Design a protein around this motif. Structure first.
Motif, short mmCIF file in Angstrom:
data_model
loop_
_atom_site.label_atom_id
_atom_site.label_comp_id
_atom_site.label_asym_id
_atom_site.label_seq_id
_atom_site.Cartn_x
_atom_site.Cartn_y
_atom_site.Cartn_z
N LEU A 1 0.81 -1.23 0.00
CA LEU A 1 0.00 0.00 0.00
C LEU A 1 0.85 1.28 0.00
N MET A 2 2.15 1.18 0.27
CA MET A 2 3.08 2.31 0.43
C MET A 2 3.01 3.31 -0.73
N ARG A 3 2.96 2.82 -1.98
CA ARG A 3 2.78 3.65 -3.19
C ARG A 3 1.53 4.54 -3.10
N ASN A 4 0.38 3.97 -2.74
CA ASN A 4 -0.88 4.71 -2.57
C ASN A 4 -0.74 5.74 -1.44
N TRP A 5 -0.18 5.34 -0.29
CA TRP A 5 -0.02 6.21 0.88
C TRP A 5 0.90 7.40 0.60
N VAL A 6 2.10 7.18 0.03
CA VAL A 6 3.01 8.30 -0.26
C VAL A 6 2.45 9.22 -1.36
N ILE B 1 -5.57 16.15 8.67
CA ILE B 1 -6.62 15.63 9.55
C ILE B 1 -7.41 16.79 10.16
N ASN B 2 -8.74 16.67 10.19
CA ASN B 2 -9.63 17.78 10.53
C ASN B 2 -10.04 17.82 12.02
N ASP B 3 -10.06 19.04 12.58
CA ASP B 3 -10.34 19.31 14.00
C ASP B 3 -11.77 19.02 14.50
N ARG B 4 -12.70 18.76 13.57
CA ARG B 4 -14.10 18.45 13.86
C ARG B 4 -14.40 16.95 13.73
N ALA C 1 -4.46 8.10 10.96
CA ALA C 1 -4.66 7.64 9.59
C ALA C 1 -4.96 6.13 9.52
N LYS C 2 -4.29 5.26 10.30
CA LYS C 2 -4.68 3.85 10.41
C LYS C 2 -6.10 3.67 10.96
N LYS C 3 -6.49 4.43 11.99
CA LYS C 3 -7.85 4.37 12.57
C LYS C 3 -8.94 4.86 11.60
N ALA D 1 -11.22 8.69 2.39
CA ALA D 1 -11.28 9.83 3.31
C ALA D 1 -10.40 11.03 2.87
N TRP D 2 -9.59 10.86 1.82
CA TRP D 2 -8.67 11.87 1.29
C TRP D 2 -8.90 12.11 -0.20
#
Length: 120
Positions: A22-27, A56-59, A91-93, A102-103
């Motif tokens: 998954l490293m390619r997708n993540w970076v 990551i969002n504060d809400r 990000a794992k959670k 989510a991104w």
């Protein structure tokens, strides 16, 4: 806060429990969201702000206050520190329900092309 290079990010995530398949997708996601920079922020039309290497969002996941106390038990300002782990564990959670969806960068640009990691 600091910036990372692709080889440094690949290694930091490998140490933080991200899969080499998954490293390619993540970076490639992170390179659009924060550009690999822990100090990066972005304001939303809904009046909330995004923080750290995964924006990551504060809400929704981190907390804007002086102490942690949100859905990932982590503070927006702790995501701006010199170790990505406060953002990476959150990000794992998120990945437990939305692995990449989510991104916006992953569904906007990582669908066309991904970078190589075989040199890392």
């Amino acid at each position: 806060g600091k910036t990372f290079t692709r080889c440094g990010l690949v290694h930091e995530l490998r140490k933080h429990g991200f899969e080499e398949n998954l490293m390619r997708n993540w970076v490639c996601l992170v390179e659009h969201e924060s550009s690999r920079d822990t100090s990066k922020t972005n304001t939303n039309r809904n009046g909330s702000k995004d923080y750290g290497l995964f924006q990551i969002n504060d809400r929704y996941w981190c907390s804007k206050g002086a102490s942690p106390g949100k859905d990932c038990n982590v503070k927006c300002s702790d995501l701006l520190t010199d170790d990505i782990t406060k953002a990476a564990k959150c990000a794992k959670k998120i990945y437990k329900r939305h692995r990449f969806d989510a991104w916006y960068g992953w569904k906007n640009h990582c669908q066309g092309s991904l970078p190589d990691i075989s040199s890392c």
